[PDB]
Short mmCIF file of C-alpha atoms in Angstrom, two decimals:
data_model
loop_
_atom_site.label_atom_id
_atom_site.label_comp_id
_atom_site.label_asym_id
_atom_site.label_seq_id
_atom_site.Cartn_x
_atom_site.Cartn_y
_atom_site.Cartn_z
CA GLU A 1 -85.69 6.94 -64.70
CA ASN A 2 -86.46 8.56 -61.17
CA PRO A 3 -84.16 11.31 -59.33
CA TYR A 4 -85.91 11.81 -56.54
CA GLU A 5 -85.24 7.70 -54.99
CA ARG A 6 -82.93 8.02 -52.28
CA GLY A 7 -81.45 5.12 -50.67
CA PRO A 8 -81.23 0.97 -51.47
CA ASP A 9 -84.66 -0.88 -52.05
CA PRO A 10 -86.34 -0.96 -48.44
CA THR A 11 -87.28 -3.31 -46.50
CA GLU A 12 -90.30 -3.53 -44.04
CA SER A 13 -86.79 -3.64 -41.36
CA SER A 14 -85.07 -0.35 -43.00
CA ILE A 15 -88.23 1.18 -42.63
CA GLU A 16 -89.03 0.34 -38.99
CA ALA A 17 -85.75 1.11 -38.32
CA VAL A 18 -85.00 4.57 -35.65
CA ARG A 19 -82.67 4.86 -38.44
CA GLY A 20 -81.82 5.26 -42.07
CA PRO A 21 -79.84 4.21 -43.86
CA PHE A 22 -78.78 8.86 -44.24
CA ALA A 23 -76.61 9.71 -40.33
CA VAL A 24 -77.82 13.24 -39.40
CA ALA A 25 -77.48 16.77 -38.03
CA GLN A 26 -79.34 19.72 -36.49
CA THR A 27 -80.10 22.97 -36.25
CA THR A 28 -81.76 25.01 -34.46
CA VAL A 29 -83.82 27.77 -35.37
CA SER A 30 -84.66 30.54 -32.67
CA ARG A 31 -88.80 31.90 -32.36
CA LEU A 32 -86.71 35.92 -32.87
CA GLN A 33 -85.30 33.75 -36.46
CA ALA A 34 -88.78 32.53 -37.49
CA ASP A 35 -91.28 34.82 -38.80
CA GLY A 36 -94.95 33.51 -38.70
CA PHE A 37 -94.06 30.59 -36.33
CA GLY A 38 -92.52 30.00 -32.88
CA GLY A 39 -88.77 28.30 -33.85
CA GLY A 40 -87.97 25.12 -34.92
CA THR A 41 -85.67 22.27 -34.79
CA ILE A 42 -84.22 21.41 -38.70
CA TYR A 43 -83.03 16.90 -38.98
CA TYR A 44 -80.79 16.36 -41.63
CA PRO A 45 -78.97 14.15 -44.17
CA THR A 46 -75.45 15.49 -43.75
CA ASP A 47 -74.94 13.58 -47.09
CA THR A 48 -75.13 15.55 -50.29
CA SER A 49 -73.64 12.72 -52.52
CA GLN A 50 -77.17 12.04 -54.14
CA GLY A 51 -78.60 14.50 -54.56
CA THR A 52 -81.43 17.46 -52.50
CA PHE A 53 -84.09 16.51 -50.44
CA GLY A 54 -87.72 16.89 -49.75
CA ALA A 55 -89.37 19.12 -46.62
CA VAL A 56 -92.13 18.12 -44.00
CA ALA A 57 -93.41 20.44 -41.52
CA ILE A 58 -95.04 19.09 -37.94
CA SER A 59 -96.72 20.45 -35.70
CA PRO A 60 -97.21 20.06 -32.05
CA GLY A 61 -100.63 19.62 -30.40
CA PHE A 62 -103.04 22.29 -28.54
CA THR A 63 -100.84 23.83 -25.20
CA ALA A 64 -98.10 21.28 -26.79
CA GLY A 65 -94.52 21.78 -27.77
CA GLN A 66 -91.67 20.59 -30.21
CA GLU A 67 -90.69 17.78 -27.22
CA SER A 68 -94.09 15.43 -28.22
CA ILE A 69 -93.18 15.28 -31.99
CA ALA A 70 -89.29 15.66 -31.74
CA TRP A 71 -88.52 12.06 -32.38
CA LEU A 72 -89.89 12.07 -34.97
CA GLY A 73 -87.55 13.86 -36.46
CA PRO A 74 -84.43 12.14 -36.95
CA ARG A 75 -86.21 9.48 -37.64
CA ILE A 76 -87.83 10.86 -41.13
CA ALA A 77 -85.63 12.33 -41.58
CA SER A 78 -82.38 9.41 -41.35
CA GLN A 79 -84.90 8.01 -43.72
CA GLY A 80 -83.43 11.11 -46.89
CA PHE A 81 -85.71 14.33 -45.70
CA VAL A 82 -84.67 18.40 -44.17
CA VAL A 83 -87.49 17.68 -41.51
CA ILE A 84 -88.75 20.60 -39.04
CA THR A 85 -90.18 20.05 -35.73
CA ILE A 86 -92.40 23.27 -34.86
CA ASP A 87 -93.13 25.57 -32.00
CA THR A 88 -96.50 27.70 -32.43
CA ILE A 89 -96.08 31.27 -31.65
CA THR A 90 -99.08 30.57 -28.54
CA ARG A 91 -99.88 27.40 -27.40
CA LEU A 92 -102.76 28.29 -27.13
CA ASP A 93 -102.90 28.31 -31.57
CA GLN A 94 -106.06 26.24 -33.09
CA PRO A 95 -105.32 24.56 -36.42
CA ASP A 96 -105.96 27.08 -38.93
CA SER A 97 -103.09 28.46 -38.03
CA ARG A 98 -100.90 25.65 -37.31
CA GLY A 99 -101.26 25.22 -40.67
CA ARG A 100 -100.12 28.43 -41.74
CA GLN A 101 -97.47 28.04 -39.23
CA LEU A 102 -96.76 24.34 -40.62
CA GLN A 103 -96.25 26.47 -44.27
CA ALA A 104 -94.65 29.03 -43.28
CA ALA A 105 -92.00 26.85 -41.86
CA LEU A 106 -92.04 25.13 -45.24
CA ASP A 107 -90.78 28.18 -46.40
CA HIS A 108 -88.05 29.47 -44.16
CA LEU A 109 -85.99 26.33 -44.62
CA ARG A 110 -86.57 28.16 -48.96
CA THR A 111 -83.63 30.63 -47.16
CA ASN A 112 -82.49 29.28 -43.70
CA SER A 113 -78.29 28.79 -44.43
CA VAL A 114 -78.24 25.54 -43.32
CA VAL A 115 -80.50 23.94 -45.15
CA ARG A 116 -81.88 25.71 -48.24
CA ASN A 117 -79.02 23.47 -50.96
CA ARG A 118 -80.42 20.75 -49.44
CA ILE A 119 -83.69 20.78 -50.16
CA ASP A 120 -85.93 20.77 -53.02
CA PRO A 121 -87.81 22.86 -52.33
CA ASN A 122 -90.96 22.19 -54.93
CA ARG A 123 -91.21 19.01 -52.93
CA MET A 124 -92.47 20.23 -49.46
CA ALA A 125 -94.53 17.69 -47.40
CA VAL A 126 -97.06 18.31 -43.71
CA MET A 127 -97.10 16.41 -40.63
CA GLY A 128 -98.89 16.88 -37.75
CA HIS A 129 -100.42 15.61 -33.83
CA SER A 130 -104.42 16.40 -32.95
CA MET A 131 -104.44 20.02 -33.51
CA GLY A 132 -101.10 19.80 -35.43
CA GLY A 133 -102.95 16.95 -37.51
CA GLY A 134 -105.75 19.37 -38.32
CA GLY A 135 -103.01 21.72 -39.22
CA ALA A 136 -101.13 19.48 -41.55
CA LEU A 137 -105.49 19.33 -43.54
CA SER A 138 -105.41 23.13 -43.41
CA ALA A 139 -101.79 23.54 -45.09
CA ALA A 140 -102.84 20.63 -47.30
CA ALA A 141 -106.15 22.92 -48.50
CA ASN A 142 -105.08 26.24 -48.40
CA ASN A 143 -102.06 24.62 -50.53
CA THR A 144 -102.00 22.69 -53.02
CA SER A 145 -98.83 22.93 -54.18
CA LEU A 146 -98.01 19.99 -50.93
CA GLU A 147 -96.52 17.08 -51.74
CA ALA A 148 -98.19 15.43 -49.11
CA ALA A 149 -100.29 15.30 -45.75
CA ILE A 150 -100.27 13.07 -42.38
CA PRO A 151 -102.42 14.25 -39.48
CA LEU A 152 -101.73 11.63 -36.72
CA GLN A 153 -105.11 11.10 -34.73
CA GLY A 154 -106.01 14.93 -36.08
CA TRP A 155 -108.43 17.15 -35.13
CA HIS A 156 -109.98 19.99 -36.30
CA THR A 157 -113.74 21.09 -35.87
CA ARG A 158 -113.99 21.70 -39.87
CA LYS A 159 -114.38 18.02 -41.22
CA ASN A 160 -114.85 18.54 -45.05
CA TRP A 161 -111.54 18.85 -46.76
CA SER A 162 -112.81 18.77 -49.66
CA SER A 163 -109.78 21.18 -51.22
CA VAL A 164 -107.81 19.39 -50.48
CA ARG A 165 -105.41 17.59 -53.91
CA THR A 166 -102.47 16.92 -51.93
CA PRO A 167 -101.61 11.86 -51.06
CA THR A 168 -103.22 12.40 -47.66
CA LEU A 169 -102.53 9.92 -44.90
CA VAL A 170 -104.60 9.87 -41.46
CA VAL A 171 -103.34 8.65 -39.12
CA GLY A 172 -106.63 7.67 -36.17
CA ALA A 173 -105.84 5.98 -32.99
CA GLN A 174 -108.43 2.56 -31.98
CA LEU A 175 -109.44 4.50 -28.95
CA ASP A 176 -109.13 8.41 -28.87
CA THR A 177 -111.54 9.54 -27.21
CA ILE A 178 -109.71 12.65 -27.62
CA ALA A 179 -110.63 13.41 -31.12
CA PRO A 180 -112.19 10.24 -31.43
CA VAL A 181 -111.98 8.72 -34.93
CA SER A 182 -115.91 8.56 -34.90
CA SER A 183 -116.09 12.49 -35.21
CA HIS A 184 -112.39 13.14 -36.17
CA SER A 185 -109.74 11.23 -37.98
CA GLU A 186 -112.74 9.12 -40.62
CA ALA A 187 -114.94 12.30 -41.01
CA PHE A 188 -112.50 13.68 -42.65
CA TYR A 189 -111.22 11.45 -44.69
CA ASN A 190 -114.41 10.69 -45.65
CA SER A 191 -114.23 14.60 -47.14
CA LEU A 192 -110.89 14.03 -49.53
CA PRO A 193 -112.18 13.73 -53.05
CA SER A 194 -112.74 10.22 -54.49
CA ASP A 195 -109.86 10.57 -57.01
CA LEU A 196 -107.37 11.45 -54.58
CA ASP A 197 -104.79 8.96 -53.32
CA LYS A 198 -105.59 8.52 -49.70
CA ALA A 199 -105.55 6.58 -47.21
CA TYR A 200 -106.76 5.78 -43.53
CA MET A 201 -104.93 3.67 -40.72
CA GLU A 202 -106.04 2.92 -37.80
CA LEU A 203 -103.97 1.81 -34.74
CA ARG A 204 -105.00 -1.35 -32.77
CA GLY A 205 -105.70 -0.15 -29.05
CA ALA A 206 -103.84 3.09 -29.42
CA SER A 207 -104.96 6.48 -26.07
CA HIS A 208 -104.96 10.61 -28.46
CA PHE A 209 -100.87 10.19 -26.65
CA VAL A 210 -99.98 7.70 -29.11
CA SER A 211 -97.15 9.85 -31.29
CA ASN A 212 -96.38 11.87 -28.49
CA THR A 213 -93.60 8.63 -27.29
CA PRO A 214 -91.75 6.56 -30.82
CA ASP A 215 -94.30 4.49 -32.38
CA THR A 216 -93.01 1.62 -34.86
CA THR A 217 -95.85 1.55 -36.93
CA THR A 218 -96.20 5.57 -37.34
CA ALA A 219 -93.25 5.12 -38.07
CA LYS A 220 -92.95 2.89 -40.81
CA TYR A 221 -96.11 4.09 -43.04
CA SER A 222 -94.92 7.75 -42.53
CA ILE A 223 -92.10 7.14 -43.44
CA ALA A 224 -93.35 4.75 -46.49
CA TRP A 225 -96.14 7.60 -47.43
CA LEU A 226 -93.33 10.32 -47.73
CA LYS A 227 -90.93 8.51 -49.90
CA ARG A 228 -94.31 7.33 -52.25
CA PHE A 229 -95.17 10.70 -52.54
CA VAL A 230 -92.73 13.87 -52.34
CA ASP A 231 -90.71 10.76 -53.77
CA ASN A 232 -92.38 9.91 -55.85
CA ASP A 233 -90.68 6.49 -54.50
CA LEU A 234 -93.05 3.67 -56.44
CA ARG A 235 -90.86 0.96 -54.47
CA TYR A 236 -92.67 2.22 -51.78
CA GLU A 237 -96.15 1.57 -52.67
CA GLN A 238 -95.00 -2.48 -51.71
CA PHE A 239 -95.79 -1.51 -48.00
CA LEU A 240 -99.44 0.41 -48.69
CA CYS A 241 -101.12 -1.53 -51.39
CA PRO A 242 -102.05 -4.05 -51.04
CA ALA A 243 -102.91 -3.34 -48.04
CA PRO A 244 -100.02 -3.62 -45.50
CA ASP A 245 -101.65 -6.53 -42.63
CA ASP A 246 -99.79 -5.00 -39.08
CA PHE A 247 -101.44 -6.95 -36.01
CA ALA A 248 -101.22 -2.81 -34.63
CA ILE A 249 -103.57 -1.32 -37.20
CA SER A 250 -107.27 -2.56 -36.25
CA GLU A 251 -109.15 -0.99 -39.54
CA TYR A 252 -107.29 0.18 -42.94
CA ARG A 253 -108.07 1.78 -46.24
CA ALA A 254 -106.87 2.99 -49.18
CA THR A 255 -107.07 3.98 -53.18
CA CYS A 256 -104.71 1.37 -54.65
CA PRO A 257 -103.29 1.37 -57.53
CA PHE A 258 -101.08 4.98 -56.62
#
C-alpha cells in the first residue's frame, strides 16, 4: 500500500542498532565539486531491489566539520536513506547560511552520478547540530516541500518558526549551557504552527556536544522521525506515539496522532 516502506517491520532493537538492515557504501563530494556548500560524504544503501530512498542532509555546528556529525551518516543510511554529511563553505557560517548549504547539498544529490538513481528527489529532509540545527529549521522555513527537519541542540537568534510546514523533531540537551533549551530548543518548538506534526525531546543530563559522538536515543528517534515523515512509514509511529518512556528522555512533547 505505502510504496515508500523500506526494510522489515521495526522494533526498539532495530531502531537502536548501530547499523540497520541495509549495507552502506559512500562517495566523497570535494569542496571543488560542491556548489553552494563546502563538500561532504554521501552514505547510501547498496541494495536497490526495494526501490529509491529519501535523502537527508546533515550540517555541523559553528567552527565544526563533518567529523562532528559523521557517525549519523551510515547509522541513518543503513535504515534506508541517502545521507550527505556536509562541510560548510566557511567554519564561520551563520545558521541561515547553513540552511542554504543544506538545501544546496540536497540539490547536489539530484545530479550526482553515484546517487541520482538511488534517491526519490521528491522526498528530502534536513538535520543539523547547534547552528546547523538552526540551519535545518531555516531550510524548512524556506522550503515547504521538505518532508522532515531535525535540529539537534539547535542554536539560532531567530526564535519564530511560524513559517515551517515541515514535520519537525526538536532535540534538546537538558544541561546545555551553549544552546540552552529554554532560550533555543523549547522556544523553537513553541513557535512551530499549532497544526504541525511536531515533537520535542529533551535528553536527560545531556550536554551541548551529545550529538558529536554516538547517542542511541538521538539515533533511534531521528530514524523513527525520518521513517514516519520521509517515507510516510506508519510502522514507526509506535515509537513516537504514545510518548516513549526512555529514562534517557527528561521531557517529551508530540502532536500525536500524526
